[PDB]
Amino acid sequence: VHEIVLTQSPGTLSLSPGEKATLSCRASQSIASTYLAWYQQKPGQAPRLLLHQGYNRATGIPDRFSGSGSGTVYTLTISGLEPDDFAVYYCQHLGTSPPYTFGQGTKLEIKRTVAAPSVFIFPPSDEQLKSGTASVVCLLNNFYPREAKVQWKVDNALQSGNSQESVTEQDSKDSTYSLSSTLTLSKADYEKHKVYACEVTHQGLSSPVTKSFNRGE
Amino acid sequence: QVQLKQWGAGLLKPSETLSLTCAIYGESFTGSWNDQLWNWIRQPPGKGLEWIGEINHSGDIKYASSLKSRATVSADRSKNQFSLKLRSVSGADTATYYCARGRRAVRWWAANYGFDVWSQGTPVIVSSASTKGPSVFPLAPSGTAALGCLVKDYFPEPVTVSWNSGALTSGVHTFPAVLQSSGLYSLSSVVTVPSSSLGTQTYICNVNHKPSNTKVDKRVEPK
């Protein structure tokens, strides 16, 4: 395609402090090194310039950050990974004229052993039912890696477009993630069905785990 | 000590106009070398960075293709400010907006040739809702158990959730809130607890939403 597209790999880099981090940025066509920059962003703050013109550290950037590459592939390398380095990293194309563009990003996170989620399903409270809406909440607790699939089933009917998820940041003690999914239904439609299941698929599970309940029982 | 201070309204109803202004401190609009680049960057929730537009030292203005019909980037020389105007705002425009400083890549072979100075940004949320206190619903537990609270239908952010007035911290997971299709936020906070103590221990979540002056204590008992 005609336009410039920066594709970063891997989408998620899982390492421990002290290891070497190799982040890649692939351009849809050849790019001069002058027009490539690297950024770091920690959750809740603005991005920070790491490298400019492909290889040059910005003011105040420690020595462990370095860049390499040419043409269509450029690399950001972190030699001795520090705990402060776990964040999101973007590459940018900033040529002699706009438009500029960024890569989709690479999340550098803490590596740990694979742990399966403990799944819980919560029926809607009677307090909420007295308002006209029914929220069914499913909990995925302390799992790793972050890649998890949550499928809602109402009377064995796979749901779609009526749920919302959110994931916590990587825990500071056990380095796991947690996930919460809410299935929203009107109170009337909620009284028309029986089985409400939360089917979870994760790398730590040899087969999908289903947490369900029967309305009324 | 070059800094950027950004100000503007972030809580917008659909079809209204986003108006943000960025103030320059420590540098002139053009710079000494006539090389300053004043850009606007957008970052939707959980997504990557998106460049919006740029007005340079000489006044030339370029927009991103997807926003060129609705964006107006300008600058006030005498006040050392530059602004971003985005009209007809919808839910797709919900994001944190930044202004940054760049330097033109002319005479590249001889400081920083990127976005080296960023402002603290502005969280822009597009919702038709007004200030509303939340409703707290229990997530009753049915050898490790889990219970929690459901903080639903409030606006705007944020809310403070505590368990037993801060006495219970181990095993607590307060998830990031999500913006429902109604324009109201919804949040859940959970905690994992040994199953044997469900009959003796008592658990009560403390929800505080200071925008609406709402402080709700809701205890969660077994079913």
Author numbering:
A (entry chain L): -1 to 27, 27A, 28 to 95, 95A, 96 to 213
B (entry chain H): 1 to 31, 31A, 31B, 31C, 31D, 32 to 82, 82A, 82B, ...
Per the authors:
In this study, we investigated a donor who developed a family of potent HIV bnAbs with different lengths of an insertion in a critical framework region following infection with two founder viruses that were closely related and underwent extensive recombination. The bnAb lineage is defined by a CDRH3 length of 22 amino acids (aa), an IGHV4–34*01/IGHJ6*02 heavy chain (HC) and an IGKV3–20*01/IGKJ2*01 light chain (LC) gene. A greatly reduced ability for donor plasma to neutralize N332A Env-mutated pseudoviruses of different clades identified the V3-glycan bnAb site as the major target for PC39 neutralization breadth. Ab crystal structures show an extended CDRH1 that can help stabilize the CDRH3.
(d) Ribbon representation of PC39-50E Fab with 4aa CDRH1 insertion. In contrast to the 11aa-insertion Fabs, structures of 4aa-insertion mAbs 50E and 55C revealed a more flexible and more difficult to resolve CDRH3. When compared to other V3-glycan bnAb Fab structures, 11aa-insertion mAb HCs (17A, 23D and 50I) most closely resemble PGT135, which also has an insertion in CDRH1, while the LCs of these mAbs are more similar to that of PCDN-38B, with an RMSD of 0.48 Å (S12(A) Fig). The 4aa-insertion Fabs 50E and 55C could not be as readily compared to previously described N332-dependent bnAbs due to their CDRH3s, which are not completely resolved. However, we were able to fully resolve the CDRH3 of another 4aa-insertion mAb 50L and show that CDRH1 participates in stacking interactions to stabilize the CDRH3 despite the shorter insertion length. These differences in CDRH3 stability between the two antibody clades might explain contrasting neutralization potency despite similar breadth. For the 4 amino acid CDRH1 insert, stabilization is less apparent. However, in both 4 and 11 amino acid cases, the acquisition of a triad of tryptophan residues from CDRH1 and CDRH3 is observed, but it is not yet clear what the functional and evolutionary consequences are of this particular feature.
